[PDB]
Paper text:
Here we present the structure of the β-propeller domain of Erb1 at 1.6Å resolution that was obtained during crystallization trials of Erb1/Nop7 dimer. The solved structure of the C-terminal domain of Erb1 has confirmed that it folds into a seven-bladed β-propeller as previously predicted. Structure analysis led us to slightly extend exact boundaries of the domain (residues 427–807) towards the N-term, when compared to the sequence-based prediction (residues 435–807) because the strand D (outermost) of blade 7 (most C-terminal) is actually formed by residues 427–433 which participate in the “velcro-like” closure of the domain. Electron density map allowed us to trace and build model for residues 515–534 and 571–594, being the rest of the insertion unmodeled. Helix H2 (residues Tyr520-Asp532) appears between strands 2C and 2E and is attached to the base of the propeller. We observe that in this case there is a different interaction network, conserved in Erb1/Bop1 family but not in other WD repeat-containing proteins, that involves strand 2D from blade 1 and a short α-helix, H3, from blade 2 (Gln580-Lys585). The third area corresponds to the long 6C-7D loop which forms an important extension and introduces Asp757, Met758 and Met759 into a cavity formed between Phe635, Tyr665 and Gln670 from blades 3 and 4. Indeed, as seen for the electrostatic surface analysis, the tool found a big region of basic residues on the surface that included five blades and the entrance to the central channel on the top face of the propeller. Taken together, our observations demonstrate that the C-terminal domain of Erb1 is likely to form part of a protein complex and is capable of binding RNA unspecifically through a defined surface.
Author numbering: 416 to 534, 571 to 807
């Protein structure tokens, strides 16, 4: 197998600290243009940052009582479609769609008109005056806490996870119609993650124990993965669509080759503590795991689409720098869409940029 030296580029150092949050950074997202990092924190704010300088350029306070242990900013993600300025934010039992005033008319109006056009498991509400001042354009109110949100590639649909909400633990929302639907009749376990396939009409649903793949067109289950863990935390799907990685609180990362077998192709043990995030690069043959030990591990993976060879996975680099706070370390991470750059969110109140 090739040495890391033969597998550059990959990140090896922290060049930039995004400093300002006054509480744990639970979630972060990079915008479609690859220039703007958004972060969500227990200090009750969402912030947007100029990625190469670390300069904070925007802040909105979504929770005025940030000391409240009952609800927090849980998950944020920029809409993936270019030039609409939309940021989705799950906080408590609500999803806000926010368009920050940092892009100008052509982009901001595109987002706002998209969200306004659409004008019972979930309710879609016009913002109050207080919410307008926070740059909220619409709010989707669910019955239970929303822990995870993920956009479909085309930027109209998004899926959310409400753990222990039974039949409505997984909801699919459609911005253009202000429509929320529960795709499933049956609740199978506590749901940890839900993600659309990169190009197939499929939804991947991660429970604590399994990953189930549904064909939304055929309306049927097509595969059930058996990772062999009791406490799955997150999944990501390889950009060419035939492989998956899964993190677990029991310190493992599982690679599943979806066509090869339902059990893990490879089990990676590179963390001393619970693994909170796994993330594929969208273009480069890289992925990462991030854990409560405060470390990020970076891997190479070559996938052989056509020929009878299984994936080649090579560890590249251990990234250290985040501080462990109350047994928590790196809470989230996301790759730049094009560069070998990784962004991480820390329990230590920082986000960080890791570069070559």
């Amino acid at each position: 197998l090739p040495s890391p030296k033969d597998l550059r580029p990959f990140p090896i150092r922290c060049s930039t600290i995004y400093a300002g949050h006054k509480g744990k950074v639970r979630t972060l997202s990079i915008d479609p243009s690859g220039l703007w990092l958004a972060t969500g924190s227990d200090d009750g704010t969402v912030r947007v940052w100029e990625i190469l300088t670390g300069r904070e350029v925007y802040r909105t306070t979504l929770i005025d009582d940030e000391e409240n242990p009952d609800y927090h900013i849980e998950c944020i993600e920029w809409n993936p479609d270019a030039n609409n300025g939309i940021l989705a934010v799950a906080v408590g039992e609500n999803i806000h769609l926010i368009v920050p005033p940092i892009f100008g008319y052509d982009i901001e109006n595109n987002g706002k008109t998209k969200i306004e056009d659409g004008f019972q498991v979930a309710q879609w509400n016009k913002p109050s005056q207080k919410q307008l001042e926070k740059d909220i354009c619409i709010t989707i109110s669910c019955k239970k806490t929303v822990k995870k949100l993920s956009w479909h590639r085309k930027g109209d649909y998004f899926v959310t996870v409400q753990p222990d909400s039974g039949n409505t633990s997984v909801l699919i929302h459609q911005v253009s119609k202000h429509l929320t639907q529960s795709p499933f009749k049956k609740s199978k376990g506590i749901i940890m993650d839900a993600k659309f396939h990169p190009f197939k009409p499929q939804l991947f649903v991660c429970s604590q124990r399994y990953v189930r793949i549904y064909d939304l067109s055929q309306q049927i289950l097509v595969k059930k993965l058996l990772p062999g863990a009791r406490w799955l935390s997150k999944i990501d799907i390889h950009p060419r669509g035939d492989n998956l990685i899964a993190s677990s609180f029991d310190k493992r990362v599982l690679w599943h080759d979806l066509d090869l077998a339902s059990t893990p192709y490879k089990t990676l043990r590179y963390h001393e503590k619970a693994v909170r995030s796994v993330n594929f690069h969208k273009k480069l043959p890289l992925f990462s795991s991030a854990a409560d030990d405060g470390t990020i591990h970076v891997f190479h993976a070559t996938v052989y689409d056509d020929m009878m060879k299984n994936p080649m996975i090579v560890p590249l680099k251990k990234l250290t720098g985040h501080k462990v706070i109350n047994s928590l370390g790196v809470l989230d991470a996301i790759w730049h869409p094009r560069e070998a750059w990784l962004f991480s969110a820390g329990a230590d109140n920082t986000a960080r940029l890791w570069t070559t």
